[PDB]
């Protein structure tokens, strides 16, 4: 589909059998979600925003459904202001910017 930007590009995602709201964010390199439990081991990672950097937990090969489209990739969990779907997953669902 085509999403306009007059309002926040919020979509429903499914992860760990739960539905959550997330922002389609072309400015983010990675996908970062609010604190939650994911399976497997995690690795440390530092990501930065306008205010500075934060430490998050990196989980790999996580199944996440975005607007019905299934994706499998790296998900970061940490103190993020909102659930963010970044370029690593946007590319998997074939998302592009057009104008």
Ligand X SMILES: CNC(=O)c1cccc(CN2[C@H](COc3ccccc3)[C@H](O)[C@@H](O)[C@@H](COc3ccccc3)N(Cc3ccccc3)S2(=O)=O)c1
Find the shortest distance in angstroms from Cβ 16 to ligand X.
19
Q: Does 52 bind ligand X (CB under 6 A)?
A: no
Specify the residue for token string 């607007």. Answer: 67
Active site residue 29: no
Find the shortest distance in angstroms from Cβ 99 to its own copies.
4
Find the shortest distance in angstroms from Cβ 93 to its own copies.
5
Q: Of these partners, ligand X, its own copies, none, which one is at the site of residue 30 (CB under 5 to 8 Å by kind)? A: ligand X
Q: Which of residues 35-64 bind its own copies (CB under 8 A)?
A: 47-54
Q: Of these partners, its own copies, ligand X, none, which one is at the site of residue 3 (CB under 5 to 8 Å by kind)? A: its own copies
CA separation for the pair 39, 43 (Å, rounded): 12
The whole-angstrom distance between residue 3's C-alpha and the CA centroid of its chain comes to 17
Specify the residue for token string 């081991």. Answer: 41
**H or E stretch covering 53:** strand 53-66
Cβ-contact 71, 93 below 8 angstroms: yes
Catalytic sites, residue numbers: 25
């Amino acid at each position: 589909p085509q999403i306009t930007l007059w309002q926040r590009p919020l979509v429903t995602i499914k992860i760990g059998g739960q539905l959550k709201e997330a922002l389609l964010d072309t400015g983010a390199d990675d996908t970062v979600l609010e604190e939650m439990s994911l399976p497997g081991r995690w690795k440390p990672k530092m990501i930065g925003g306008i205010g500075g950097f934060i430490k998050v937990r990196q989980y790999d090969q996580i199944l996440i459904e975005i607007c019905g489209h299934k994706a499998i990739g790296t998900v970061l969990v940490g103190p993020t202001p909102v659930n963010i779907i970044g370029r690593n997953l946007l590319t998997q669902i074939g998302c592009t910017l057009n104008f």
